[PDB]
Paper text:
B. megaterium SqvB adopts an α/β fold with a central, characteristic β-barrel and belongs to the cupin superfamily (cupin from latin cupa, a barrel). The role of DUF4867 family members in the sulfo-SFT pathway has not been determined.
Native and SeMet-labeled SqvB crystallized in the P3221 space group with two molecules in the asymmetric unit. PISA analysis shows that the two SqvB bury 3353 Å2 at the dimer interface, accounting for 16% of the total surface area of the assembly. X-ray fluorescence (XRF) scanning using a beam energy of 11 to 13 keV confirmed the presence of Fe (Ekα ∼7 keV in the emission spectrum) and Zn (Ekα ∼8.6 keV in the emission spectrum). These results were corroborated by quantitative inductively coupled plasma-optical emission spectroscopy analysis of BmDUF4867, which detected Fe and Zn in a solution of the protein.
Author numbering:
A (entry chain B), B (entry chain A): 2 to 223
The structure:
Amino acid sequence: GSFQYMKDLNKHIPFYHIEDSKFKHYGKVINEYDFNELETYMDSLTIPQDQNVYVASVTEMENTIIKNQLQEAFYGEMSIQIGYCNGPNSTLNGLEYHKSSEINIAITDMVLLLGKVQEVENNVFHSNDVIAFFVPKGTAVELYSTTLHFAPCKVNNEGFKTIVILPKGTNDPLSTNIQKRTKEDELLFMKNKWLIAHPEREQLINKGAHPGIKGENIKVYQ
Amino acid sequence: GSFQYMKDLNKHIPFYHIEDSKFKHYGKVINEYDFNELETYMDSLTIPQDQNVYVASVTEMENTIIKNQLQEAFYGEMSIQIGYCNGPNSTLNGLEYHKSSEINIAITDMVLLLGKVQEVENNVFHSNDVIAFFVPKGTAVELYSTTLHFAPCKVNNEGFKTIVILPKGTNDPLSTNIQKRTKEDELLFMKNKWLIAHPEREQLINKGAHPGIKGENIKVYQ
Ligand SMILES: [Cl-]
Ligand SMILES: [Fe+3]
Ligand SMILES: [Fe+3]
Ligand code: NA
Ligand code: NA
């Protein structure tokens, strides 16, 4: 099916299924929960064709039995938000991390281009360290805090839909302009979000993102 | 030198300095902040001789410039608490993680026994996967969310003192009794804290901890 097709089209990058043991360094597949209340909301959305969209916190999705289950158990009673990231993207563009776990639920098939925070050296990450993981429709994953990640890359021509679950407030605008002291301070970009942008990605550079991906702006062919 | 003395006494454990590059898999050494406000408070304490003490949130230590600096920059605007863990312990006892970053600042020399969350299999962690890191007085470290850790082990006969900084609420008592569904739900122990206890530690098992460390309850000799 789509997995083998995509693997064949992407021999320029290491390209694995999300169920591969290689994913274990980056996160965990979550199997025990069902997400019908969230799927219902996501069915009412359209995928944008001009650029990706991200909404960090959606009342409809947070006002659900499943959000309470995930807050009290998966996040150990820390307050969460549930949003979405949908779009037409096929390129790496940037890599971010949070000092928290993220859940991504694939509402369509999609690909995640991932890295490790430990592979950042002096605010540079090399494209040649990226690994791609094919995530089938319906699979939920935890991305660990040490996993660099960004918007998905599409599998179907029509683009992708994903649910994104984070501690409440993550990705909100910064309310203060810190006096930068550490290397990582150069990467802080939104609340609980550190970002390394590809220099060829003008949409990020124009917002003041730190240019730090060295290498190709990887494309996922489909 | 205390480091080489301790390394020589602990050849049964892989034993490294916190400045060793191996620690970069588990966290980061924090170098550009000034913790003098907190050091002043910690100098006013002695070390308990009978058992460890952990106080999660100390108002005086949170009403500091450093607290604001670390909240707005290191934690990217997410609310934090500042407390301490001091005591006479020399054994592994347990291994915990949070889905957040922790800062430990060594007020005395101390040793951290660490593991990786990805090395847990069916809620078991093997003692032979533990690594020890010697942390000199004055060093501050970030422990990543994927780093299993617990209370320090002492270097000096008098015990150790450490500052512990976490997202606000971490380690509070759980307010809900979840339906257990995932393996990790068996480990949830306090707010934002999952614990794998050594089966010999009744102090932990009696409080509801999951016995899951297979192997010796490692002792750090000094
Ligand atoms: Cl990791
Ligand atoms: Fe993210
Ligand atoms: Fe901890
Ligand atoms: Na499970
Ligand atoms: Na329990």
